[PDB]
Amino acid sequence: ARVAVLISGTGSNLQALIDSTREPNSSAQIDIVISNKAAVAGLDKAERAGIPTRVINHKLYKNRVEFDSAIDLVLEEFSIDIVCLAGFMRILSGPFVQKWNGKMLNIHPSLLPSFKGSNAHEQALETGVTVTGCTVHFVAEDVDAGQIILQEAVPVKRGDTVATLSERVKLAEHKIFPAALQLVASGTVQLGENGKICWV
Ligand SMILES: Nc1nc2ccn(CCCCCc3ccc(C(=O)N[C@@H](CCC(=O)O)C(=O)O)s3)c2c(=O)[nH]1
Ligand SMILES: NCC(=O)N[C@@H]1O[C@H](COP(=O)([O-])[O-])[C@@H](O)[C@H]1O
């Protein structure tokens, strides 16, 4: 399965995916890394690994559909089968999400459905949970319909901040995200006709 990784920043999840896809038994190959922001560290990791990179500045487009079209064109150029969102900070348009339904994964730093949206760690700390975690799910038009592939719980320690909590959660992301990619790329997991997760 040919994979694109969309990033917006540091790219530690990207790096975890690169490491796992270079394993002999990997069913996924990363063929293109797309950032919406230039000069982010995730682009260096991609280039260091020999993976083509494309910057597609969302700010240069009129709306999301024009921006998403630029991305979709690169995905077609590279004959992509699967799209991993790994720190991607742009909400995607409905038709794009529809087109890639059942083919686009996302890592989210909470135990969905808890703490949706952009500041999950902030919300978790404000709420005072002692257990949080991360979630790999298929992307639907809203974070609510996205079918969940894997999750891993992570403890919240007393005194945790966004910096320390996100550091601990990221260790779990770097585990379940490569595993979830391997599950989908190998055909072991897919969206069924029900639209719910199907294990083969
Ligand atoms: N249709 C759809 N699209 C996408 C893209 C990722 N996910 C799944 C990941 C869900 C994680 C939560 C969030 C991700 C991005 C957020 C956001 O607010 N982006 C602002 C810029 C904010 C900023 O950087 O200051 C914007 O795009 O305007 S929130 C989805 C999805 O499930 N459905
Ligand atoms: N909007 C979703 C979101 O906030 N996802 C989070 O962004 C980080 C990306 O880090 P990375 O660039 O080092 O992989 C990850 O911690 C991921 O859980």
Question: Which ligand 1 atom sits closest to the C-alpha of 96?
Answer: 1
Closest listed residue to residue 19, CA positions, set 90, 86, 76, 88: 86
Residue 173 backbone class (left: φ over 0; alpha: ψ -120 to 50; beta: rest): alpha
Write down the experimental method used for this entry. Answer: X-ray
Q: What is the resolution of this structure in A?
A: 2.2
Query: Could you tell me which residues are annotated as the binding site?
Result: 11-13, 64, 89-92, 106, 140-144, 170-173
Instruction: Give the Å distance between the CA of 115 and the centre of ligand 1.
Output: 13
Q: Which residues pair with 5 in a beta bridge?
A: 33, 84
34, 143, 148, best to mutate for ligand 1 pocket (most atoms within 8 Å of CB): 143
Residue nearest atom 4 of ligand 1, based on CA coordinates: 91
Per the structure, how many domains does the chain have? 1
Closest listed residue to residue 92, CA positions, set 43, 54, 47, 56: 56
Domain that holds residue 5: 1-200
Residues at CB less than 6 angstroms from ligand 2: 7, 9-14, 42, 86-87, 89, 107-109, 118, 134, 166, 170, 173
Element at 54 (helix H, strand E) = strand 53-55
Closest listed residue to residue 151, CA positions, set 128, 121, 131: 131
φ/ψ of residue 75, rounded to 5: -60, -40
Instruction: Give the Å distance between the CA of 62 and the centre of ligand 1.
Output: 17
User: Within a 10 A sphere around the Cβ of 119, how many other Cβ atoms?
Assistant: 13
User: Within a 10 A sphere around the Cβ of 178, how many other Cβ atoms?
Assistant: 22
Gap between the Cα atoms of 187 and 32, Å rounded: 21
Closest listed residue to residue 108, CA positions, set 3, 13, 2: 13
Cα R_g (the chain), whole angstroms: 16
Catalytic annotation on 108?
yes
Gap between the Cα atoms of 131 and 110, Å rounded: 9
